[PDB]
Amino acid sequence: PFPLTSMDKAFITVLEMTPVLGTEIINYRDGMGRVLAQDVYAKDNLPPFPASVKDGYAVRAADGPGDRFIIGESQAGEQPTQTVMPGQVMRVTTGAPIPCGADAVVQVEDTELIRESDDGTEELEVRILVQARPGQDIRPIGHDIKRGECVLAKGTHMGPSEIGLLATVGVTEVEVNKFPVVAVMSTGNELLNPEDDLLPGKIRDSNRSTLLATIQEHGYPTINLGIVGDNPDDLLNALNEGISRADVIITSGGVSDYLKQVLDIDLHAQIHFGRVFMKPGLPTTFATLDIDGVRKIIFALPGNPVSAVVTCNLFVVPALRKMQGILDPRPTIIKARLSCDVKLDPRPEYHRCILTWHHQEPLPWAQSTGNQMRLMSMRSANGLLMLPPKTEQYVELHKGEVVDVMVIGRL
Amino acid sequence: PFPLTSMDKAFITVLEMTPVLGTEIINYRDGMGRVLAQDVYAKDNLPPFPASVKDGYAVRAADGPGDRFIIGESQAGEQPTQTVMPGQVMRVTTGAPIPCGADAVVQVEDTELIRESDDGTEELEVRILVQARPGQDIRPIGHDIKRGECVLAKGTHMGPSEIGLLATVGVTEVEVNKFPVVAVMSTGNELLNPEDDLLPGKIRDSNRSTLLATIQEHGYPTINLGIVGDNPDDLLNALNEGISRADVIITSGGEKDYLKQVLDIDLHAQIHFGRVFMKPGLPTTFATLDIDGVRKIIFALPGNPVSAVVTCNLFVVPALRKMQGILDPRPTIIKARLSCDVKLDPRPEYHRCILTWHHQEPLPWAQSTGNSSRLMSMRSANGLLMLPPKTEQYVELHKGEVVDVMVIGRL
Amino acid sequence: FNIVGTTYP
Amino acid sequence: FNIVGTTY
Numbered sequence: 001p002f003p004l005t006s007m008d009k010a011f012i013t014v015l016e017m018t019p020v021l022g023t024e025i026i027n028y029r030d031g032m033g034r035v036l037a038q039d040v041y042a043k044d045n046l047p048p049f050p051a052s053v054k055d056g057y058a059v060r061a062a063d064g065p066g067d068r069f070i071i072g073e074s075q076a077g078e079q080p081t082q083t084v085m086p087g088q089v090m091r092v093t094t095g096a097p098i099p100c101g102a103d104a105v106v107q108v109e110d111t112e113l114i115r116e117s118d119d120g121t122e123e124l125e126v127r128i129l130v131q132a133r134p135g136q137d138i139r140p141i142g143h144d145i146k147r148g149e150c151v152l153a154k155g156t157h158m159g160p161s162e163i164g165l166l167a168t169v170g171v172t173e174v175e176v177n178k179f180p181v182v183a184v185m186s187t188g189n190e191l192l193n194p195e196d197d198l199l200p201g202k203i204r205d206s207n208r209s210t211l212l213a214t215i216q217e218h219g220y221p222t223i224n225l226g227i228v229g230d231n232p233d234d235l236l237n238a239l240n241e242g243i244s245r246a247d248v249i250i251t252s253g254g255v256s257d258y259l260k261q262v263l264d265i266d267l268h269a270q271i272h273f274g275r276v277f278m279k280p281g282l283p284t285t286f287a288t289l290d291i292d293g294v295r296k297i298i299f300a301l302p303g304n305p306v307s308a309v310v311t312c313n314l315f316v317v318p319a320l321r322k323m324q325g326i327l328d329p330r331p332t333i334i335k336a337r338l339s340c341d342v343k344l345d346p347r348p349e350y351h352r353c354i355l356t357w358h359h360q361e362p363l364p365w366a367q368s369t370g371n372q373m374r375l376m377s378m379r380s381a382n383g384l385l386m387l388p389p390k391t392e393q394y395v396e397l398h399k400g401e402v403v404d405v406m407v408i409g410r411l
Numbered sequence: 412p413f414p415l416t417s418m419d420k421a422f423i424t425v426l427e428m429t430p431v432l433g434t435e436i437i438n439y440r441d442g443m444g445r446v447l448a449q450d451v452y453a454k455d456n457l458p459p460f461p462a463s464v465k466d467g468y469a470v471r472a473a474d475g476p477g478d479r480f481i482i483g484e485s486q487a488g489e490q491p492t493q494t495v496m497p498g499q500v501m502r503v504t505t506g507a508p509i510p511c512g513a514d515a516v517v518q519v520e521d522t523e524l525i526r527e528s529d530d531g532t533e534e535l536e537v538r539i540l541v542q543a544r545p546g547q548d549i550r551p552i553g554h555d556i557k558r559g560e561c562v563l564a565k566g567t568h569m570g571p572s573e574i575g576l577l578a579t580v581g582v583t584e585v586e587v588n589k590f591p592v593v594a595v596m597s598t599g600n601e602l603l604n605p606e607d608d609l610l611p612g613k614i615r616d617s618n619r620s621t622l623l624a625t626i627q628e629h630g631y632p633t634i635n636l637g638i639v640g641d642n643p644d645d646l647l648n649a650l651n652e653g654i655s656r657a658d659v660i661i662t663s664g665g666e667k668d669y670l671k672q673v674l675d676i677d678l679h680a681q682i683h684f685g686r687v688f689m690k691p692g693l694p695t696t697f698a699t700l701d702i703d704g705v706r707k708i709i710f711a712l713p714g715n716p717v718s719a720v721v722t723c724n725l726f727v728v729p730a731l732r733k734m735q736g737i738l739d740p741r742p743t744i745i746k747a748r749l750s751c752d753v754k755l756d757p758r759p760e761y762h763r764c765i766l767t768w769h770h771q772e773p774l775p776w777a778q779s780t781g782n783s784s785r786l787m788s789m790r791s792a793n794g795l796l797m798l799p800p801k802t803e804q805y806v807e808l809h810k811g812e813v814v815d816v817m818v819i820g821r822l
Numbered sequence: 823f824n825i826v827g828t829t830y831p
Numbered sequence: 832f833n834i835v836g837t838t839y
């Protein structure tokens with residue numbers, strides 16, 4: 001007899017009661033998806049030497065437009081040793097360091113060759129046609145990155161670009177938030193393992209395989225607790241191992257006495273809600289357990305396969321993201337058009353769909369595949385349609401009308 | 412002297428010259444991101460037994476609404492042994508199998524208790540108030556999935572939902588396309604390792620770290636060839652090892668002409684283009700090599716970090732996706748609004764950006780942070796802005812106008 | 823934001 | 832759909 005909890009009350013409750021994990025030191029190569037728990041400062045200047053921007057000649061601006069002797073060429077990886085004297089110039093490339101005595105670089109397009117070398121290619125003398133500006137076409141020391149400058153702020157969710165940035169400044173070790181370890185178990189006497197052949201009155205367990213695969217997609221470590229029989233003893237033993245090995249425990253099915261009893265009386269855990277006004281996902285249950293100053297969270301998902309995966313993306317996924325240090329764990333919601341007419345239900349409805357962009361059409365189309373038992377497309381569902389509850393004015397939606405779609409997969 | 416190649420010609424050439432990999436057998440747990448190379452058939456019926464939909468009693472429709480004796484109760488996971496005779500009914504649950512002799516199920520809300528069991532618990536007699544329809548509230552044998560029915564077609568890109576389906580039908584082993592192995596190397600005499608402190612005339616290699624991180628995000632195995640000196644001997648040895656160990660080779664980084672010598676004369680490879688009319692990505696080079704009836708592909712990306720990552724997502728990523736058996740390896744392009752006014756360049760322009768959806772605004776906004784004046788946001792770039800070439804009418808683009816944006820990251 | 827979708831004209 | 836950017 002648990003009061004009907006609204007979607008908003010349930011969703012906010014999960015986020016508020018979900019704690020943030022501690023910190024650890026990792027290598028920068030494994031920084032993908034991690035959240036910085038420290039500020040990152042550069043210890044060197046970039047570039048460490050004055051470098052040319054264009055292909056041409058490094059010149060002295062004070063000399064002005066005149067005849068110059070080419071004394072040599074600067075190459076990348078080699079610090080120049082020659083000094084540019086008045087009336088002299090040096091061949092330079094886009095990546096080469098600027099030699100001493102030079103204050104400007106003139107590109108080849110503004111020059112004319114006076115003399116070719118009688119043999120073996122090379123350049124001897126050149127005419128400067130343009131009055132060069134002091135510091136023209138030169139990248140000064142520390143132009144891009146200064147010493148002591150903060151290159152990455154605390155709380156930054158690092159991607160491929162951020163990793164390369166770390167490599168540039170020479171920070172190979174960084175402090176990040178820990179990743180949550182999730183344990184998943186299934187309850188039910190009618191459940192068998194996928195590898196087994198069917199027996200009378202038995203079916204194969206599909207929820208466990210799907211739930212684990214979903215969590216793995218977001219990059220979190222998982223633990224398989226296997227199938228647990230529907231009895232008080234086995235639930236206690238299964239949950240005890242889950243708490244000991246993981247921070248998060250997820251169970252599926254068998255809701256409609258033993259599960260909620262052991263959590264309350266035996267485990268002394270705090271059950272927040274047991275029923276939520278939604279379709280599907282009615283018997284969804286969420287509870288927290290505090291042991292040794294550490295908070296463990298437990299998710300009890302419905303037995304229905306569709307109900308399990310829907311509640312997973314709505315409740316479990318945002319919860320997991322908060323623990324790893326993500327500042328905004330709320331999912332991305334976009335606008336799309338309905339592909340088919342739908343009748344509204346008194347409950348808010350959620351069902352998997354496919355987002356497709358057409359030729360120069362500003363809004364994407366959402367194709368309903370949620371009514372399984374089944375549309376066979378070559379593509380997997382990448383969105384979750386979010387239909388509004390039935391009202392006095394709105395009872396039915398028509399094809400083409402704009403609705404909200406929550407992105408749940410890589411587009 | 413490589414001819415200026417249009418963007419369209421270059422992109423189509425890459426896809427046309429990129430081969431499709433062979434097949435292999437994997438476990439269903441590792442099927443994430445894999446593409447099926449076989450048709451999948453169910454070997455069992457789901458459900459394998461007639462199951463109730465509602466909580467109530469299994470009745471004989473011919474008996475109609477009347478007083479019935481309760482002979483027992485059916486439980487999930489156990490095949491019923493009792494036979495329902497005329498004038499009798501059996502107690503059932505939502506997951507329980509339908510007993511013999513019963514052809515319909517009436518939910519408990521349509522029944523009332525008549526008599527107590529004289530002592531203890533259980534119910535012996537109950538009144539049925541509604542005339543049951545034949546087959547009412549019952550899931551027949553093979554209602555969802557029939558034996559011999561195709562549940563997954565060849566070419567299906569499997570996600571979490573597809574994995575669970577394999578577990579349901581009991582297919583633990585499936586044939587899929589192989590994943591491409593990519594080797595990444597860097598060229599330049601000025602390059603040092605990120606773990607090393609800086610030396611005069613040297614900088615840290617960032618391309619190698621970034622390129623690997625990008626490919627790893629898509630789930631492909633990678634090989635680090637390290638830093639290679641700018642000389643024909645070291646290049647030849649590096650490329651030879653890459654071909655022997657990997658299917659795809661990626662190199663980074665005037666200076667352009669020396670590299671292709673090893674590819675053309677020594678490696679006997681076919682270079683398709685050396686220049687592409689684009690900004691950035693001008694010195695992009697693509698070549699193919701046919702050895703032992705197997706085609707290896709080689710990408711030569713610019714030395715500049717920004718130019719490298721842009722060309723990687725434009726050319727390398729779609730090529731890799733084609734190799735793993737994806738039917739449409741072309742990237743996803745959406746419509747978005749410009750955040751700032753931009754001047755158009757004679758070349759087609761690409762620039763990293765961040766996609767954000769606002770309150771009830773149908774189109775997302777794109778914020779330019781790729782330009783370097785790196786703007787420090789807590790989020791990594793998930794899109795690539797696609798700006799049009801300069802035209803007779805358009806020399807400048809205005810704020811709010813709709814432009815093309817290529818999705819490159821998880822939203 | 824809100825979990826319920828809702829719509830506009 | 833084309834790789835080259837378009838406008839309206």
